Design a protein around this ligand. Sequence first.
Ligand SMILES: Nc1ncnc2c1ncn2[C@@H]1O[C@H](COP(=O)(O)OP(=O)(O)OP(=O)(O)O)[C@@H](O)[C@H]1O
Ligand SMILES: [Ca+2]
Ligand SMILES: [Mg+2]
Length: 537
Amino acid sequence: NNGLTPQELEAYGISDVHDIVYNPSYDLLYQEELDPSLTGYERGVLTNLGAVAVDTGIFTGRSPKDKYIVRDDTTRDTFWWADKGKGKNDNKPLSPETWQHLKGLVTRQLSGKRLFVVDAFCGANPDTRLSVRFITEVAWQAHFVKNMFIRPSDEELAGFKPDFIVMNGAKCTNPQWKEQGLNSENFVAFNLTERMQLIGGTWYGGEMKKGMFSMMNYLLPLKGIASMHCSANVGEKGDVAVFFGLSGTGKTTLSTDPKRRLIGDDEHGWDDDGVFNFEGGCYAKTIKLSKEAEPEIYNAIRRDALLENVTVREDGTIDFDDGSKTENTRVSYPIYHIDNIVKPVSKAGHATKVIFLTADAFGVLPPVSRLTADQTQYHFLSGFTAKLAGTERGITEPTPTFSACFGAAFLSLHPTQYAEVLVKRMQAAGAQAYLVNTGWNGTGKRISIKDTRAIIDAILNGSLDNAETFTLPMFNLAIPTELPGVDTKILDPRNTYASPEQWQEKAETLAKLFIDNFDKYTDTPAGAALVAAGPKL
Ligand SMILES: Nc1ncnc2c1ncn2[C@@H]1O[C@H](COP(=O)(O)OP(=O)(O)OP(=O)(O)O)[C@@H](O)[C@H]1O
Ligand SMILES: [Ca+2]
Ligand SMILES: [Mg+2]
């Protein structure tokens, strides 16, 4: 039906496939999205910036409650199941039977129509990458995966064999859900024996992106390769830095620095050769976006970029400040929309700087701290930050949260498994870790992007490592006495309070939350020993 034969899709259970649009160019996608006869959520609008904008419907973020993984002989003893030992997680078990029902709904839905099939790679390295095949009936969805995943060359497509198949049946729902013990009529299901992901009900593109990240998070650590929820860049001297963090904490904004070559902004692996990007694009947040503060991200918004849920006025101009649809407004663009990037392949050497970004809503943690090896493990496992996004934050949150490894929602294995491989990679490279508060302090306002950038610079240029430091009580974090380019006043979180006693109060409350959260890791001699690295009242 074009590139692919209708019979190859029949193997997946899809029938009467009328027309196949295989690996569409950006030009065909542009034409497809602007088709005047499109209706509903398939419709695209042209903005004054040249980029097309879409409305993802009801779902403006991920639906963790609708995430299920089939429990069978492949995943039984390896997955970090939500219903097993100590472990707050979204890995809810699903029966092969219910899975077959869901598959029937999606294949029936995709049957008898024109489909968009995009073949792409997840992982920059040939040896550990997943060849993924995406099937959708909605043009902008194909566009999303074209932007986010690694676009294969013509010769690569020649002998392309899918390792994983993602079927997006956003238009259908499961009416038998109550009867089947599911959360709702929507679903994001994974089956590792069949190597497939099914999406129903939710149009949100993030589900495909994070779904494959969840799969990489399962496969890579099993072979000794770290799978990380971080941004990464390289300086001209070949020095690599990785920035860990949750939604909206600064991974994207802080890694996009003109003096450094961007490797990626969200998901990376770490093998014997170094750090590699899993993706071929960036997924930036756009609420309150200002070209003055984020010129590189602003300029990447042009033809081929795909805006999501932003408010477009009558004259086609965008209102980036408007969060009435959702505060989780986004834009995806192929990585090349950023000028200073690593190419042709998104990879670099071993990371020597590991930065943990935390958006502290309590206004307790210092702007920056140099972590000891034990504190590194402790804070990585604790993953304290704020859920300021992921479905609509920046006003409906920040919700204080402890997200193991700074990405609990995408972990398929136990948090300790990610911690050990990461610690292994850091040791071999002599990497140092730092904790950075991109959140709030005593002023009730977020730390300015300018002060944060100066801090990142200080870390990257080593001025932080050679600065005199003193210990912050309770948390026992080593903070610099002064830093070039940064206002000395903010370095000590107690100073932003009219009384350090006010700080004491909040700091004791936060410390208790940390101690409470960590107790679930004290089971092993290791976890038990790490308690000494955490807060002490
Ligand atoms: N000091 C600061 N440092 C970083 N980001 C800041 C700061 N002050 C405000 N922000 C805002 O916080 C948000 C951080 O978003 P960013 O896209 O970097 O999050 P992320 O870590 O990449 O999240 P995700 O995992 O969802 O991609 C941006 O909207 C940015 O403008
Ligand atoms: Ca992310
Ligand atoms: Mg991002």
